[PDB]
């Protein structure tokens, strides 16, 4: 690994409560300022990154309900006006679409039963929002028509809280994971789903009830699977076992689009090992080009790997540490051009690392 | 190898996403 970073700044949010999420806005055009959002307690805060490590506070959203606790956020844009948008959700199970320019709530969606653990936007259609919940289901929303396209759960759905989910690069399929130790595949390029999405745009709307995934395994990890991301046709997933596991459904040669729903095989390609990240609910992230992988630990250390180096042990970068950063890093975010890496903590602190 | 093949998939697909982002002019926050 070639990558090096310098800690240029840090701050602490006045509420002192844990920050669960951080996301840079990757929709902002080249040349425009690098903006990121943080989520924790009943707050959503926007910051702008300037020269010489300057972190400029933009606006603070404070939820009317003092008992709300936001766990996640995701960015999108209005497909018609090119206006940026921000979706947030947490313990209350309510999705809020916030205008990040005015820091005011545009709309909300109840729908979900219980806590929403993660939000993700489709990489091609800015209107398709995926929420994962404590009620064991995933939900696909069309935020342009305010319709719930599909509910993924039921007969062969998750058996405990869904903690994380990810769309692949072209937005053809989703991998979900959770407290039941399983990773489940849900194809959205199926005729049924592609037609349900088309119908959501023609719209009481009848949501699809997807009771059956296209793959399911519980042989990767021995505990809660708290983070999942696609890496091409391969999967990156972790539990609390001090490793991120790189694997694929089926046998070594099995094509991701040829595996059948009953496929019982699973192939591990490698593991990215680290230390002191043995506690539940710690997220890993990648930059846009998927050249870098980052993960924070329970003790303030930030691990980085070069995904372009085949051997994961040889892929290891110099671990990022600051003597004042001792609290659990819940989530990290790379700016679209990966020149900036932000980490957020349990002590409401925010850390800015700039590429050297 | 499985690595090089997967790397080209990521490269091809992220390029498609990058091109779609380049045609866009999302207003500043
Ligand atoms: C950082 O968040 C992550 C990371 C990975 C997967 C999912 C989540 C979202 N979680 C929010 C919840 C939570 C509530 N409180 C008070 C917490 C304190 C510390 C950590 C987590 C929590 C969790 N449930 C299941 C209990 C899941």
Residue numbers in the entry:
A (entry chain A): 78 to 280, 288 to 440
B (entry chain C): 40 to 68
Quote the study that presented this structure, word for word.
To elucidate the binding modes of EED396, EED666, EED709, EED162 and EED210, we determined the crystal structure of EED in complex with each respective compound at high resolution. The crystal structures were solved using a EED-EZH2 peptide (40–68) complex, except for EED396, which was determined using apo-EED. As illustrated by the biochemical results, all five compounds do indeed bind directly in the H3K27me3 pocket. The phenyl moiety of EED666, the furan moiety of EED162, and the methoxyphenyl moieties of EED709 and EED210 all make cation-π stacking interactions with the guanidinium group of the Arg367 side chain, with the characteristic face-to-face orientation. While the central rings of EED666, EED162 and EED396 form π-π stacking interactions with the side-chains of Phe97, Tyr365 and Tyr148, those of EED709 and EED210 are involved in cation- π and Van der Waals contacts. The pyrrolidine-amine moiety of EED709 forms interactions with Asn146, Tyr148, Asn194 and Glu237 via a water-mediated hydrogen bonding network. It delineates the depth of the pocket and functions as the “gate keeper” restricting access of the compounds into the deep β-propeller center of EED. It is interesting to note that the side-chain of Arg367 is flexible and can adopt at least two distinct rotamers. Refined 2Fo-Fc map (σ = 1) showing the two rotamer conformations of Arg367 in the EED-EED709 complex structure. However, they exhibit significant induced conformational changes for residues Trp364 and Tyr365 (with a movement of the respective side-chain of more than 5Å), moderate changes for residues Arg367, Glu238, and Met256, and minor changes to residues Phe97 and Tyr148. Together, these changes result in the formation of a much deeper pocket as compared to the original aromatic cage found when H3K27me3 peptide is bound.
